[PDB]
Amino acid sequence: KVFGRCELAAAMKRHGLDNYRGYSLGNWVCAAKFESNFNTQATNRNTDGSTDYGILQINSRWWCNDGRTPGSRNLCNIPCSALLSSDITASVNCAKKIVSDGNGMNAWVAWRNRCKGTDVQAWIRGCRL
Prior knowledge:
The chain is about 30% helix and about 5% strand. It has helices spanning about 5-15, 25-35, 90-100, 110-115, and strands at about 45, 50-55, 60. A hairpin with a 4-residue loop joins strand 2 (about 50-55) and strand 3. Pfam families: Lys.
């Protein structure tokens, strides 16, 4: 599924991500935008041979098992495919875990490089939340 901007934010709010660990809703939407372009089916291969999966580009080295990632923890206890679903529940639950493992939203390098410090509320602008 390829979500609308405000459509993603609503579903993200409904699932408890607005100021989850202190990060306003626009930080999550901004992350989604540059990681996945709001596409739940996005996949990308990392240089270390793992792949990133889904709206929030959650990765197989630690978070999920895709059956082709060596030295891989599955800390979110999900097959990586669960993260490509039109239902964001598993992505959003895995995010919550990732964002709490010490380095906050800096785990998503796109967020650090592209969202961190910017006018992030712009991403939840115009939206009926």
